Each structure stands twice: as structure tokens, then as C-alpha cells.
Symmetry: C4
Subunit: 80 residues, 4 copies
């Protein structure tokens, strides 16, 4: 992606690949290698995403927020 260090990828139920990056983005990648979307946080995403049973993607950022992102890439909430 963009981050020298990547976090560890998570695999969604539909096979989307999620990885966080040093460049502040959480990347969602289709199984063919094409970017599905990328979500901007305010800091480096070193931690590995977790995926809930409805498909929500949870990941921490160094901007101090735990993010909850909908599978379509839109913010659901952030926890402070």
C-alpha cells in the first residue's frame, strides 16, 4: 500500500482484504488486487483491523480514535 509497515491484513466475509497503513489510510482491496476504497484517518494505522458479524471494520489509529467503518467505506462512528 503506502505504509512501509503494514498492519496485518484482515479478510472480510465477501473476501475483501483490509490493511491499515503508515500513510494514515485503511485500505480495502478487492480479491483481484484492485482498490475497492481507502478510508482516511488522522494518523498512522499500525493495528490490525477486526471485522464484526455484520461486516463493520474496526481499527485503531494513532490520532487516538477507534474507528468503526461500514463495508462501503463510510464512517459509522469513532470512539475517543
Amino acid at each position: 500500500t503506502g505504509g512501509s509497515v503494514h498492519s496485518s491484513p484482515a479478510i472480510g466475509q465477501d473476501g475483501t482484504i483490509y490493511v491499515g497503513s503508515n500513510d494514515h489510510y485503511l485500505y480495502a482491496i478487492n480479491p483481484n488486487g484492485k482498490l475497492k476504497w481507502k478510508f482516511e484517518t488522522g494518523g498512522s494505522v499500525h493495528s490490525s483491523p477486526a471485522i464484526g458479524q455484520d461486516g463493520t471494520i474496526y481499527v485503531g489509529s494513532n490520532d487516538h480514535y477507534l474507528y468503526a467503518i461500514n463495508p462501503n467505506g463510510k464512517l459509522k462512528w469513532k470512539f475517543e
Copy 2:
């Protein structure tokens, strides 16, 4: 949460989201983004929690303890 670095979140069977933090807390977050509880350890919680089959949350802290926390947020035991 509070930690610049978050650990990687774990997802409980009822959907609670658990993440450790630099601020010494393990956070339990409801799926709507509201704090369910937070558990105080004596040091920074860099490691990612694991969840047992009865729902117990295990996480290490830099106070040198492996903690076992009940789903209600109460200490079950700590290992030294």
C-alpha cells in the same frame, strides 16, 4: 480510545469490541460506539485481547500480568 497506539481489537460473541490502550486501560465498547466498561491495568496494554469460549477476555499488560477479565468487566484472575 486513549492510547495513541491501540492494540488490535477483538470482537466478542455478543459483538462487544475490546481494545487495549497506551493509557493502561482495556476498553469494552458496545457496537453503537458507547463505552460498555473500561478495565484498569497497571501499565500500557499493547497486546491484542483474546476471547475464550465462555467470553473471558485475556490480555497482557506491561505491569507484567496476563489478565483474565469477565465479560462484565470484573477481574477473574491475573497471572504473574
Copy 3:
């Protein structure tokens, strides 16, 4: 345990809790908090263990070996 930093714990199928430690040991802990056994590697165990379908515990150490440990705590093999 002994390590200031713990790795992230893994949970075996029988509920044993495995965590690696800065003190060079991989710890196996019973669900009641009592040490089941500890396995000595030649260096700090920062990575998180993985558990195979027969229950073998795989974990890397900074002595440069990937260890495969039987559930009874005895070495199965190490990879160099």
C-alpha cells in the same frame, strides 16, 4: 507472566491460554490461572502463537527459530 511486553495470547481448543514472553518462555496457562507448563526458547518471544488443528503450538522466538510445541509442552520440532 514474566515479559513486560506479552505477545497476544492464543486460546487452545481445550481452553488452555498460550502467551509468549520477553523472559524467553512460552507460557501455557490453565483457565483457572494456574501455570500448566512453560517452554524455554533461546530468546524473547514477541510474536503471537498459532494453534494447529491437532493442537500443536507454533511460535517464533528471537533465537531465530520457529518452534512447534506439542500440547504437553514438549518440543515437536524447530525450524531454522
Copy 4:
């Protein structure tokens, strides 16, 4: 393996053990401890691999690529 630090291992559905290494390789190890194959990236592989439902192995490298590797050890794609 070769890396002082190993990433955390992943276990494939057929029981192959995958671990990334400081030496730039992702190692695939048979359950008997014998090297199945190793895949060369352009940098240190600190993150832990994830395994898709068809068995593809995804892992990030410090050469800035998220790699997708077929179970036979051949590159499927890399994401930039």
C-alpha cells in the same frame, strides 16, 4: 526461520504454516518442519499473514507492497 523477529504464524487449511521474516522472506513450512517454499519480497516481512477462503496468502512487506501469494508459492498480485 531467518528473521530475528518473526511475525505471527498463520495456519493454512491444509495445515501449512506461514510466517514472515526479517530476512525478506515469507516462509511456508510443512507440518513436519520441512520447508515447503519461501517467497522473496523486497523488504522485511513484519506483519502476520492472512489466508483467504481459496487459500491465497496475503502479507505486507516493508518494500511497501501488500502481496497476494498463491498456495504454490507463486505471486498472484502485489498492491502498491
